[PDB]
Design a protein around this ligand. Structure first.
Ligand SMILES: [Zn+2]
Length: 128
């Protein structure tokens, strides 16, 4: 199945030249679906949610212009064929959503990210 669309993300895309891109697309759409309730609660909007795979291996995600574009690494940085665990990707997704509000990695940022991580778990547990 195609995951239910998230009203708060306008478009998702994945890297078309990578192996198992069909899998990758299902994965980023499942991420989008799973965070839909949290985004509604926090009035978060994202225009583009897309996959990237930077040479810089420490790079896992990025937020361009407070949600205009969020980029997520979906694949292991030492093996293109292997996808990162859903838990890891969701963690990065919540990190980048926090940057819709807060730029620097200061107390405001970490406090908010901690609230989002906590709340997202409860949302999933209850299937909201
Ligand atoms: Zn950050």
């Amino acid at each position: 199945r195609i995951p239910h669309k998230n009203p708060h993300i306008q478009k998702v895309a994945v890297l078309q030249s990578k192996p198992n891109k069909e899998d990758a697309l299902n994965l980023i759409k499942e991420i989008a679906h799973k965070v839909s309730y949290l985004m509604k609660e926090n009035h978060f909007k994202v225009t583009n949610l897309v996959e990237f795979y930077p040479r810089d291996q420490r790079l896992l995600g990025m937020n361009v212009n407070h949600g205009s574009k969020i980029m997520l690494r979906l694949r292991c940085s030492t093996d293109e064929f292997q996808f990162l665990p859903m838990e890891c990707i969701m963690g990065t997704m919540l990190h980048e959503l926090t940057h819709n509000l807060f730029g620097p990695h200061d107390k405001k940022f970490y406090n908010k990210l901690d609230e989002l991580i906590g709340r997202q778990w409860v949302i999933e547990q209850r299937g909201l």
